[PDB]
Design a protein around this ligand. Structure first.
Ligand code: SB4
Ligand code: OFZ
Ligand code: CA
Ligand code: CA
Ligand code: CA
Ligand code: CA
Ligand code: CL
Length: 347
């Protein structure tokens, strides 16, 4: 059995195996807070997330199970996955704390673009990696729904991983959210995340936020100025009569030619943005299709753009008692198998 030690971090006690040393806070994550650490077993740097009150309510308990199940399933170089999961509890009866461990990523995407005019080749690499991660999660019927620069972890070499996907069943930015999500439209698909990629890519190319709306109405008006007024077919998706009447009442605006908006950008980048930033979600390019776009020609490699194993989400439709979610979560902690340190081979 491993020996644990206690340390106060972010004003609360963390209890971790002695394997993990030099814990230092690196910010909050979804439903928890994160510390960087040194893994003395492998000499690797890791990030340890302590979930906040994982079993306080049925909402917390199911979200704890959801996150652990998802992260145990994700095995892709552009998606956050698990090196370890632990609890100081010796039994289910004692079980009240869950810690998740992944490879340390020092920054988020806001740290990459803030003080650096990115080259086009570098933007290609960043967006390529997002799309590769999205192809993988979407292939398991998992959608992010709130993709944004602060949900993209990046290391010192610009390697990127998607995180905080598949969650949520504090005031957040809405500047990157798909219109169908921001406005609660009745049905949507995986391409909500592609809208977000378009917003991110636009900002990496120009250094400016594409749609910096002050509220949901101002954000919609900014979007429509770029993409033009939608047809009546799009109203089909909106439940609220007041919202439909409002949108319908707006003066007709033509779509802008993106070449006149992103002056000086690679024409292939402009073409890709035109395919991502479409209001018709059935018309939006998918992640897999975007990976084949000529903008990524120097990075694209079909042998290294894998899909996910099938993911059983049947638990999502079930209402269970708190102790049932807790026991299921405990089972998943105990059954976790750490991956090999080296899981890759030369092409
Ligand atoms: N520094 C770093 N490195 C990797 C991941 C994270 C991380 C996690 C997280 C998720 C699962 C897990 F098992 C361990 C940690 N959740 C939020 N963050 C963020 C902390 C600050 N914003 C950027 C990443 N932070
Ligand atoms: C922070 C800087 N970003 C912006 N001012 N974005 C809004 C503009 C862009 C999106 C719509 C079409 C064009 C291009 C004109 C506006 C509205
Ligand atoms: Ca390759
Ligand atoms: Ca490597
Ligand atoms: Ca290897
Ligand atoms: Ca090959
Ligand atoms: Cl599974």
């Amino acid at each position: 059995r491993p020996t644990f030690y206690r340390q106060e971090l972010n004003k609360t006690i963390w209890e971790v195996p002695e394997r993990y040393q030099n814990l230092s806070p690196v910010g909050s994550g979804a439903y928890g807070s994160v510390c960087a650490a040194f893994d003395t077993k492998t000499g690797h740097r890791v990030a340890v997330k302590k979930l906040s009150r994982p079993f306080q309510s049925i909402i917390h308990a199911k979200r704890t199970y959801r996150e652990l199940r998802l992260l145990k399933h994700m095995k892709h170089e552009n998606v956050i996955g698990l090196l370890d999961v632990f609890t100081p509890a010796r039994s289910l009866e004692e079980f009240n704390d869950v810690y998740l461990v992944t490879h340390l990523m020092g920054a988020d995407l806001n740290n990459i673009v803030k003080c650096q005019k990115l080259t086009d080749d570098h933007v290609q690499f960043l967006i390529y990696q997002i799309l590769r991660g999205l192809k993988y999660i979407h292939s398991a019927d998992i959608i992010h729904r709130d993709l944004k620069p602060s949900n993209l972890a990046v290391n010192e070499d610009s390697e990127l991983k998607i995180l905080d996907f598949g969650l949520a069943r504090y005031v957040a930015t809405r500047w990157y959210r798909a219109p169908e999500i921001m406005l609660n439209w009745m049905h949507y698909n995986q391409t909500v995340d592609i809208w977000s990629v378009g917003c991110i890519m636009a900002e990496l190319l120009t250094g400016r936020t594409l749609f910096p709306g002050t509220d949901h109405i101002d954000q919609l008006k900014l979007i429509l100025r770029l993409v033009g007024t939608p047809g009546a077919e799009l109203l089909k998706k909106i439940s609220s009569e007041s919202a439909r009447n409002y949108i319908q009442s707006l003066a007709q605006m033509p779509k802008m030619n993106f070449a006149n908006v992103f002056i000086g950008a690679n024409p292939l980048a402009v073409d890709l943005l035109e395919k991502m930033l479409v209001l018709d979600s059935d018309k939006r390019i998918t992640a897999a299709q975007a990976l084949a776009h000529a903008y990524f020609a120097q990075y694209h490699d079909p042998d290294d753009e894998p899909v996910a194993d099938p993911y059983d989400q049947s638990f999502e439709s079930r209402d269970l008692l708190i102790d049932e979610w807790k026991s299921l979560t405990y089972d998943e902690v105990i059954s976790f198998v750490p991956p090999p340190l080296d899981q890759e081979e030369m092409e």
